[PDB]
Structure formats: C-alpha cells, structure tokens
From TrEMBL, chain A:
This is RP21. The keyword Repeat does not apply. It comes from Kluyveromyces lactis (strain ATCC 8585 / CBS 2359 / DSM 70799 / NBRC 1267 / NRRL Y-1140 / WM37). Residues 164-182 are annotated as: Disordered. Keywords: Ribonucleoprotein, Ribosomal protein, RNA-binding, rRNA-binding.
Automatic annotation (TrEMBL), chain B:
Component of the small ribosomal subunit (SSU). Mature yeast ribosomes consist of a small (40S) and a large (60S) subunit. The 40S small subunit contains 1 molecule of ribosomal RNA (18S rRNA) and 33 different proteins (encoded by 57 genes). The large 60S subunit contains 3 rRNA molecules (25S, 5.8S and 5S rRNA) and 46 different proteins (encoded by 81 genes). One of its GO terms (cellular component) is cytosolic small ribosomal subunit. GO terms for biological process: cytoplasmic translation. Belongs to the eukaryotic ribosomal protein eS4 family. It comes from Kluyveromyces lactis (strain ATCC 8585 / CBS 2359 / DSM 70799 / NBRC 1267 / NRRL Y-1140 / WM37) (Yeast). PROSITE patterns: RIBOSOMAL_S4E, S4. Keywords: Ribonucleoprotein, Ribosomal protein, RNA-binding, rRNA-binding. Residues 41-105 form the RNA-binding S4 domain. The lineage of its organism: Eukaryota, Fungi, Dikarya, Ascomycota, Saccharomycotina. Coiled coil: none annotated. This is 40S ribosomal protein S4. GO terms for molecular function: rRNA binding; structural constituent of ribosome. It holds the Pfam family S4. Transmembrane segments: none annotated.
TrEMBL record, chain C:
Belongs to the eukaryotic ribosomal protein eS24 family. This is 40S ribosomal protein S24. Keywords: Ribonucleoprotein, Ribosomal protein. Coiled coil: none annotated.
Length: 182, 260, 134, 169
RNA sequence: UAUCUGGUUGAUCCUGCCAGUAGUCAUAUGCUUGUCUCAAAGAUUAAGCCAUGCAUGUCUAAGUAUAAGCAAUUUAUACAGUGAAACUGCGAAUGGCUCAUUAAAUCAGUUAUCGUUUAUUUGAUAGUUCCUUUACUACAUGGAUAUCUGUGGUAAUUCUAGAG
RNA sequence: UUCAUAAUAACUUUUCGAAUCGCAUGGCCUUGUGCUGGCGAUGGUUCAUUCAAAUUUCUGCCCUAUCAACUUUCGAUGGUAGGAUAGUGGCCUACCAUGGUUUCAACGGGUAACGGGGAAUAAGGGUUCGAUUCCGGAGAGGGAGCCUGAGAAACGGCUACCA
C-alpha cells in the first residue's frame, strides 16, 4: 500500500480485425519503416490519436480564450520539438492532420537510415538493438525512441563499440589470435 | 475507530507537504499542537523534502537531538511537530532562519529570513475572551494564547508577538483597505487589499480582496490573515509576493528566462 | 587513457550533520565502472577529506558505461563520520566492524522464551534440577 | 492436590473457580487493569491437601538440625533515611554517609567495597532545588502582580481617553 | 480516433432476433515462454476450520536498587559506577486484515455542539490550607505491599499460599 | 443566550492548593554553617489549542404493488416533569394527548448490496462493476456483558452461554 503505480494499456487495437486494405496498409508501414509488430504501428496511431483527441477538444472551444490557446500552443510546442509537425504549420488545426507515417519517420529507427550510417533501414534496428548508436553521449537501444529534431544532428555511432572505431567487431579477437598462430 | 488515529497514510497526506507518492506507505502524521493537521507542516517534511539538510528521517531525528533547531524560540526534538503558518524555524548552525509562509501556488516555501526580523511572529485572533481572576485574554489561530491584551485588539485582527518572551509588540486592526495574506485552498497564499466584508448572519464572513494586479477575489475570514496596511506588509514575503499569475503568464516567464 | 574524470555536483554544506553532502557525477572514457575505494581516494585528494571521512553511495551507471551518478558525502572529521552515519556504511568502507549477531527469528524465539518465564531464571533451573528425581 | 492455592476468606474444603482482580493475591494480572477467573481452593482444610503452611511462632524443646539453630541474616535492609533512623535508633543529630552494609566482593585477585543506593535526605542539592522552586513560585507571582498592575494602569489610561471623546455635544 | 457483416427467401424489401466483431488493473483455464522496468496475487465458494512459530511493548543526567548481580577504581563512613528483577508511569483503542451485517442505515459533500467529553499537544495560571492570636511535627508524617530470603503444592498453566 | 465573567448563600461522605526527582554550587556577612539564589524534570487546576469524539442539518441510494397500507398491547408521534448520559434527545420512566409516515411509493420483501472515492467501457447521452492500495463504516466463531483506561461495549483483555 505505497500507491498503485499507474499504467496504461497504452496501445490499442482497431475495432475490426480484418479490413483487408488496412492489413496491407499496416504491412506497408511495417515494411517501409521496419516494424516488428502491428503493435508498433497502433502504438503510434494511439499515441497520435491522444493528441488528435486533445486538438478536437480544444477546437470545440474558441481559440482566443485561455485553455484552447495555452494547452493548444503547448501541444504544438511539444510536437515541433518532437519534430513531427512542420515549422510551416503551427496552427493546431494542422495538428489534427498528422498521420502515423509522419510519426514513424521521426523515430530513431529511421533517423539512423535518413542520416546514412546503416544502409537498407532494418540494419539500423539491428544496430540500435546491438548497442551502437548514441543520440547524446548516451547509448539508445530502443528503435522507437522518437528523435528530438534538435538532437537529430547529434545522432552518431557510439563512443564505445565499433563503427565509431573504438573496438572493431568480436570476430577480430578470433582471427587476430588465429593470424598470430600462423 | 475506538478513539483517535495514530498513523497518517501517505495518499491521505495533505498535498502541501508535496510528499512523494512512492517511497513510503505512510506519511508523518503531524502531531498535536498549535496548527491543524492539514494546515501544519511537520519538520521531517521541512528538513528533508524541502531543505534537504537531512537525507532521511534518521538524520532529521538526530538533527533535532543536536538541537540547534529552534521552532519559535523553544527547541523541539519532535520529528513531526506542527510547524504551521508563521512559525519561525531558526537553525543556529548555518544561521538559516526560516519563517513559514505559503508560495503563491499553495505549497509552503523556504524563505531564508534575516537574523533579525525572525524574532517576532505575526499571529491572528480567534478570541478575545476572559478567563478566571477576571483576566481578559487573547488567542491566536496560529497557536498561542496571550494574556492581558489591549482592549481594542478585536477578532480576526492580527497581533505581532515578541516570540522569545511571548507578549505583545503591536497589533493591526482588521478593516477596509488593509494588506491581507490568504490561507484558504484556492486563494491560498495570495495577497491583497480588502474592499468589502460581507457580514453574513451565520454563514461565514466573506472578504473581497484585490491584489497588486487588481484581479478581485473572495475568501472567508478564517482563511485571511492581516499582514499590514497597504505598501508595508510586516513580513518579508517570497519572490512572487502574493500576486498569483495566470497559467500562460507563468509559461511566458519560464521560456523567456533562459540564462545558461 | 581514461583518468576516472570525477565531478562533484550539488555541494550542500551542512554544519548540522558536519559534512558537505553532494552528488558525484563520474566518467569512464574506455574504462568500465569506477568502483568505490578508487572514488574515495579521488574524493580524499580533491576535498582534503581522507578516505576515512568520505562516504559515497547509490551510483548505478547510466547505460553504455559512460557515466555514474553517485551521492558523495565528505564529513568534517573521522570521529564525526563515525557517530552520524548508519552502521552499514561504516562496514562498507572498513572503518567500523561488522556487527556479528543472531538471526531474526532466533531473536524473536529468544524474546518469547524469555517472555514465557517470569523473574530470574535461577529459580526455574533449581526447580528443574529437583524434578530429575521425580 | 492438583494444586490450586487455598485462598483466605473463601470458606469450604472444596475446589472453586473464582473471579480475581488486581488488589488481591491469587492472580498476577498481565494487564494494567484486568479481572480474570483463575481457579482456587477454599480456606478450610480437608483430606485432599498435600501441603499446609505453618508459622512456627514460639519455640519448644527439640531444635531440629538447622531450622531453629542456624540463622540466615537479612539480605536487604533500610533504604530510606527514616528507615535507617528507626532500625539503629539514631535521631536527627547524628549526621550521615555510614550505617550501611558494605560488602567486600572479589573477582579473583582484586578485592573492593560495594554499597547501596540510599534515598531521602536534607541534601544540599535537595534543599537548593526546593529553594529554587520556592523562588519560581514567588517570582512568577510578582511578575503577574506587576503585569496585572500595568494593565490596571493601561485600562485606566484608555478610560481617560474614552471620557475625553464622549464629552463634547 | 460516432465503422458493421453471415443467417428465415426460389429472390426482394423489412420486423426481428441469433452469430460474429472489439475491450475489460474481469475471473478462470489451454497451450506456449529468452531478457529489461513494473508488479497484483484465498474477495467471489465457507465471515469454514485452524498444528507450529512469529505479528506490542517500553527507561532516560532525571519515578522506585544492600540481585548474598556485574562492577573495580584513587566522592560515599545515609547514598552517587553499571543494573536483572520487579511495582509506578505510559502504550497495548495504532496499524494490519476482512465485507457478514447494513438500503435513509452506512457513505459523500454540507452545516452545526449556544448540545458535549477530549490523556496527549503546545499556550495559561493558584500569598487566603490557619480558625482566636502567651509555649505549635514541617530542616520532612505512617505502616503496608512487591521484587527478594526461603518454606511449598501440582498430572497440567506465562497457577501462585504462608512467614521474614 | 440563562454566554464569558463577576457577586450575595451555603454546603460537600470538602476535589485542588507539590511531606516528588536529576544536573549546576552562585550572593550577602547580622562569621552562623546563617539566610539566601541558577538550569531543569515531572506532576497538578479550570481556561485555551491540537489530535479527535459523540451527536446532528440539508440533499442524495439497487431491484419489487406476484409488498397498499404500516407504526401505536411490549414508545409509535407529540407534550410536561423527572431519571440517566459527557452532553441533546422517546435514550429511559410516570402522567397526559392521538399523533406519525404513505401512490412525490410509507410499510414489507429481495439483493450472488458494505458506502464513497473510483474502474471498464468510451463521439454526445450512457451502462455495468467498485471484496480490493485512500477516506468512512462496520466485524473479529456467534450473540451478550463488562474491567482498566483520555479513548474499548477492546476481543493478539477478561466474564459467561451457545457452536
Ligand atoms: Mg482499525
Ligand atoms: Mg456559528
Ligand atoms: Mg556497451
Ligand atoms: Mg507494567
Ligand atoms: Mg452508440
Ligand atoms: Mg418465414
Ligand atoms: Mg435459401
Ligand atoms: Mg453477442
Ligand atoms: Mg532508586
Ligand atoms: Mg453561564
Ligand atoms: Mg479538563
Ligand atoms: Mg429532561
Ligand atoms: Mg453483503
Ligand atoms: Mg454498490
Ligand atoms: Mg469499497
Ligand atoms: Mg462477498
Ligand atoms: Mg478501511
Ligand atoms: Mg473464522
Ligand atoms: Mg466483544
Ligand atoms: Mg485488534
Ligand atoms: Mg484477534
């Protein structure tokens, strides 16, 4: 009885299971942006839908009066920092049209691929999980990390491990011993 | 059940401790004393969560045993003494005296007060009554009873208290156009002037109180504490000074002020 | 190579506890882990405290080695450090001794076996010796 | 037999369950305020007894081994000053620091003197603590007499101000 | 983040229901199960039953000490260092568990106690006890009871009877 | 306010007004060991305050008319007086009056009902759930009765009867 640490079943399924075009359209997304699950998509869709839900419940009220203006702006501020929303569009009514595809292209997954490094997309997810890639001076092994647009530039290979060039790749310790034997 | 309650469970812990949801099933029950359960502040919260002079309750306990801590002149060794509103807490090692005063948000604040002024405690009324030997006596909402007061120290009117001796330095009357600090929930820790006093028969005396910014607000009398006449409040108040800004106003001041 | 680049954030000086209490941000450039005995050497030379009076805890490195964020105290003296600090921290450093004691349940069994009797145990032992004939 | 103690004032030569509070014997109460029904034997003697206690008040002919030959001295004695004053029979004028059974106990080679913890005296520290309390009693009475006089004066000072304001129209 | 399909027909459009569909800090189970953080967990049926052990006791410069205890040594010719035991004090009415009762009852907010108790809490504080006033306990009144000393019982028990 | 409080009158199986305790050993000589005085502890009186405590105001519950009357001999509703209680009171007692509630569902029954906070669901309106981390309330096998105590109708107290 400290307190129930709250949580959410955050990421929530669609209300049918077999809309053929959705089943493809979700595959397309998991193929383009390399997602192991449908979950990874619904995760974004819900995470996004929560925002949308705010935007609707702000746009119901008059933008000029307080919450509408403040919470809406803070909601926009949040998105532009996370880098989904453009700098062309900061008008709340544009937040309403954000979509899942724009959210995914902001993940650390993709911003590896968009800055080169990996080649062929998935490789990044593998690099990320395999403890390379440091956004700050701090390793990240979540693919779905959401990059901060400000921090985008700081994405490089880790101080530790290969590719940064500290230690080469764990079959060298095999063949450096094997070549020394010959 | 079966008489008074000895524990206080942390979620039930009054919010203006700013006690931590986790890191303990319980909260420190403020012990019995001059200030009401929720309106008090037990020293564990003061010395640990607020000031961080202790890293845990143990160290607070010892800090009170060695004994430089002196809440309102007297020493205290009580981990959960009701150090409520106005209570001058003087730590003689460091010389860091603190008056207990509400931040505009509502939650109490560390005000790193002078030698010096932390020497009187402002205190309200309460009573006016008389006791035995026909002695007229005054009582402070903020704890103490003081004997033989000036006849025209009336009710809901403040009194400066000598604190170390515990007598009467001076008093501020309650009436129209007098700087008034606030101690009631939503308007808690705001400051203002006083315009009206709706008398009201039975159902609580109201007071219409314009701040520096002249945003009017109403409270009840019981939640109002006359800090002086306008311009000169008798206590040194924290940065913010009882204004209470709007939400966007606070967001503006934060993201404007970025000095790395 | 590495140099164990120690730092010392949030120095809250404390006459009530007779210490400077603070966080220890630390680094490992290519080394892995800092270790505590190595830290108190680095806190001794930095604060003029000596290993004895320094008391550090918490840490838990970030991730990718990188960093470690301790919670270093530096007392005013060794005698001061002994009489304030909880015993377990004095055991860690080798200053105080580990308090050799009986198990918890055995202490409670010993409490209740003691609760069961009344007065002095010399009376019940002499009665028990008399019952050997019975 | 069986082993229930013959409580006095009970009557009958029979076994009786009986309610016994603190303030009597026959029950060592393990709560500060508590009654309880322990069993008890009556006061009158019957065949079922193993044991009667018998105070051998006045002596007779045959002294038996060491029941009336040897003498076990008193372990404890007078603690209070008025007790030591009765026991020896000294009165007030004899003064104090001695009449006490110090014991010379040995650990092994070392041999040194024990002593009691005797109470009650007109001690210098006792006297001064009374005089201090007596002073506080007087000084607190003066201070409140002074404070009462000051507000008897202050009320009169206000009373003159009321009379000046009132008389006009 | 307002969503519908299959089914009575020869086929049609309805009434209509059933069936699916999604989710449940909603129970159960069936497979399967590598890691990280977090983490409910004998409520549902029997407020059914309970071996064993434990979960409430507490002493400070500071209520009571000739333990025939420990101390031991450079305050005791009444006492003063530690202190088992015990009485006194206070606590054990807190917490914990549970949901059987219980349907204007409980309970929520709302008042009220000018209708009351309140150890503790921190603030306050009692020349008047005398009883005619020329020789009176007050620089200190009394005897008990416990722990103890033994005398014991019992088939048992955190049973305790007598004397000092 | 018949309040606070103050008076006149007394009582009373005359409450309380320290025959209590640890550290500190100062100040005047009427040169006694005199008279004097510091820092604390507990205790103790009603007034305060706090922790609370009992009541109590208003409004608010799930299903059932295959419950339309119910309460009032055995307190129901009111009154006068007492008794009790810490205290208000049909809380109890005497004497008196005949009230009281009801289709704006009294009363009765049901509840696989502890109440609330909340939970799930999730356009809006809602439905169902809330034993369960907080807040109330109850209970400690049942049902009683009580000791101590500020606070217990305690149950890691006791007395009993049933099981
Ligand atoms: Mg309880
Ligand atoms: Mg009122
Ligand atoms: Mg690594
Ligand atoms: Mg006891
Ligand atoms: Mg609908
Ligand atoms: Mg048909
Ligand atoms: Mg067909
Ligand atoms: Mg269905
Ligand atoms: Mg003693
Ligand atoms: Mg009156
Ligand atoms: Mg009282
Ligand atoms: Mg009456
Ligand atoms: Mg039920
Ligand atoms: Mg319900
Ligand atoms: Mg509930
Ligand atoms: Mg149930
Ligand atoms: Mg509860
Ligand atoms: Mg049971
Ligand atoms: Mg009972
Ligand atoms: Mg209990
Ligand atoms: Mg029990």
């Amino acid at each position: 009885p400290r307190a129930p640490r709250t949580y959410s079943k955050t990421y929530s399924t669609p209300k049918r299971p077999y809309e053929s075009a959705r089943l493809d359209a979700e595959l397309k997304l998991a193929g383009e942006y390399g997602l192991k699950n449908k979950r990874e998509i619904y995760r974004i869709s819900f995470q996004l839908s929560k925002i949308r839900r705010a935007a609707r419940d702000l746009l119901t009220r008059d933008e000029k009066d307080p919450k509408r203006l403040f919470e809406g702006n803070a909601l926009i501020r949040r998105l532009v920092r996370i880098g989904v929303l453009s700098e062309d569009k900061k008008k709340l009514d544009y937040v309403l049209a954000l979509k899942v595809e724009d959210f995914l292209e902001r993940r650390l997954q993709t911003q590896v691929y968009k800055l080169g490094l990996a080649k062929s997309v998935h490789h990044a997810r593998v690099l990320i999980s395999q403890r390379h890639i440091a956004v700050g001076k701090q390793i990240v092994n979540i693919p779905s990390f959401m990059v901060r647009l400000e921090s985008e530039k700081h994405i490089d290979f880790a101080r530790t491990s290969p590719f940064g060039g500290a230690r080469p790749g764990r079959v060298a310790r095999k063949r450096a011993a094997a070549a020394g034997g010959e | 059940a079966r008489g008074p309650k000895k524990h206080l469970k942390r979620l039930a812990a009054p919010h203006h401790w700013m006690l931590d949801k986790l890191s303990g099933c319980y909260a420190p029950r403020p012990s019995a004393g001059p200030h009401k359960l929720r309106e008090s502040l037990p020293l564990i919260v003061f010395l640990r969560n607020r000031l961080k002079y202790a890293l845990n309750g143990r160290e607070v306990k010892a800090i009170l045993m060695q004994r430089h801590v002196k809440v309102d002149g007297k020493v205290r060794t009580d981990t959960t003494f009701p150090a409520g509103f106005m209570d001058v807490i003087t730590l003689e090692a460091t010389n860091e005296n603190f008056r207990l005063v509400y931040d505009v948000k509502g939650r109490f604040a560390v005000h790193r007060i002078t030698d010096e002024e932390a020497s009187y405690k402002l205190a309200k009324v309460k009573k006016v009554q008389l006791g035995k030997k026909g002695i007229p006596y005054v009582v402070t909402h903020d704890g103490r009873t003081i004997r033989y007061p000036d006849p025209n120290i009336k009710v809901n009117d403040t009194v400066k208290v000598d604190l170390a001796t515990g007598t009467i330095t001076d008093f501020i009357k309650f009436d129209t156009g007098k700087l008034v600090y606030v101690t009631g929930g939503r308007n808690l820790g705001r400051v203002g002037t006083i315009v009206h006093r709706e008398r009201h028969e039975g159902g609580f005396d109201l007071v219409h109180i314009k701040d520096s910014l002249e945003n009017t607000f109403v409270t009840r009398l019981n939640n109002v504490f006359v800090i002086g006449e306008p311009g000169r409040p008798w206590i040194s108040l924290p940065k913010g000074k009882g204004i209470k800004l709007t939400i966007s106003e606070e967001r503006d001041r934060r993201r404007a002020q970025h000095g790395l | 190579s590495d140099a164990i680049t120690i730092r010392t954030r949030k120095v809250i000086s404390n006459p009530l506890l007779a210490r400077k209490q603070f966080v220890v941000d630390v680094l490992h450039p290519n080394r892995a882990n800092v270790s505590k005995d190595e830290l108190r050497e680095k806190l001794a030379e930095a604060y003029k405290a000596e290993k004895d009076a320094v008391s550090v805890f918490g840490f838990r490195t970030q991730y990718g080695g990188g960093k470690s964020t301790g919670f270093g105290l530096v007392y005013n003296s060794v005698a001061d450090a002994k009489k304030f600090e909880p015993a377990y921290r004095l055991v860690r450093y080798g200053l105080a001794e580990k308090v050799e004691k009986a198990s918890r349940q055995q202490r409670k069994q010993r409490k209740n076996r003691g609760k069961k009797i009344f007065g002095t145990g010399k009376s019940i032992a002499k009665k028990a010796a008399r019952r050997n004939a019975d | 037999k069986q082993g229930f103690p013959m409580k006095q004032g009970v009557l009958l030569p029979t076994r009786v369950k009986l309610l016994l509070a603190k303030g009597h014997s026959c029950y060592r109460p393990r709560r500060n305020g508590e009654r309880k029904r322990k069993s008890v034997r009556g006061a009158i003697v019957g065949p079922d007894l193993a044991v009667l206690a018998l105070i051998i008040t006045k002596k007779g002919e045959q002294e038996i081994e060491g029941i009336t030959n040897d003498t076990v001295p008193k372990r404890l004695g007078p603690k209070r000053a008025n007790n030591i004053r009765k026991f020896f029979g000294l009165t007030k004028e004899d003064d104090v620091r001695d009449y006490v059974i110090r014991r010379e106990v040995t650990k092994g080679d070392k041999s040194y003197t024990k002593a009691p913890k005797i109470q009650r005296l007109v001690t210098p520290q006792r006297l001064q603590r009374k005089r201090q309390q007596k002073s506080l009693k007087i000084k607190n009475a003066q201070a409140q007499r002074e404070a009462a006089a000051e507000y008897a004066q202050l009320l009169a000072k206000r009373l003159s101000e009321r009379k000046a304001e009132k008389a006009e129209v």
